Amino acid sequence: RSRAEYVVTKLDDLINWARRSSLWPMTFGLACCAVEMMHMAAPRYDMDRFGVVFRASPRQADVMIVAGTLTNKMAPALRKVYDQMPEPRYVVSMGSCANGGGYYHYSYSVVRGCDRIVPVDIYVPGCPPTAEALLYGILQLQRKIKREQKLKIWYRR
């Protein structure tokens, strides 16, 4: 192909590498799944070693880890915090509650999945899914945002 598209592809590689190497989350943590989140933060799995910084503010956050049961009383707060997060933002839903309501699916005060409120990038299944599996979801997110070609789309505009 053209020489300019090669440079554009390499620039996409650099930008995607930066975004997946420096992935700062805030965990909108509610429950059991947030406990298992901090077990992934724990020294065995070491997302800080992976480049993923524990306890970041929503202003400095890249991905929101929806960890727990999203209730009707909490969904406006979830949407507000998601709106306060800057534009390059991803969503990792974790657990059956945040995925599709889970064990409280037929409840009067439980939102059937956080995808009804925020656009979810990756769903992590389990109740709770292990910290091993959540770290799998994070690495899958890094691969997914490695697959992005934003300057390639812009050049092909």
Partner: protein
Amino acid sequence: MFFINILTLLVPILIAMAFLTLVERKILGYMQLRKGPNIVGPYGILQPFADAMKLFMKEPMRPLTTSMSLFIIAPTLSLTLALSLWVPLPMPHPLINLNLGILFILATSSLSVYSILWSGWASNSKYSLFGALRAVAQTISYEVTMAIILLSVLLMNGSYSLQTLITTQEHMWLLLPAWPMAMMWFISTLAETNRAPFDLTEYAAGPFALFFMAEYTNIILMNALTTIIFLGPLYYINLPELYSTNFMMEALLLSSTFLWIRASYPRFRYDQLMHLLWKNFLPLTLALCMWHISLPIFTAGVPPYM
């Protein structure tokens, strides 16, 4: 040649800042029975570069209600004051030899607390403004105790120069004559840099990266200043590389001491921090200030003007 000397001073300082972020991550991980970043790069040496590139690549969520003037001014001011703080430092020879370099240092810290106050007022939130007022009061109180401590130790030294400090330190460390002053100066530098246990903690992407850069640069500088003042490196007129290496080693130990303290201790309360300063340091600071006024008079050890 002077511009080359400017470049070879400032660029390695920024490299030291980025790798200070990396070594803080690694030391905190290894003190928490885990590892630092090592996947990003060979042994994590590309992790601060990835962090900086992501921070400059992410779009800054700029609220329209925030004043663009102050939003611009605060981080650029903080970084330029960190670098201006770095310039008049002899290692054992400075880029710029100032007659009153320590006064220059303290007043540059005053302009830094302008920077944090302006950032807090620009951040249009009442909780942000409250935390800003708390942080300015913290920085201000530890600045007044730094100024009195530093005045007394230069009453022992002789002038506000730093080569005069090197000539003072070429026989022994100032830590032995002024070690409680050294302890209070160390705590004061900690609370200036807003490190744990005095952190007591708004900006996204670019400005956040700039504030992070300036804060870590100030951390390295407080370590270097503590080294140059209280713990004199070995100086010889026929070789300055020994002084540079020994100052390097002591600055690395003091930076590791800040990361050590952050790992070890829980943070203070705001009332407890003000109580600690205004009821334990400043009485001791004033008493030792008058003691170090009295000391050359009754020992006849009045230092020379040069």
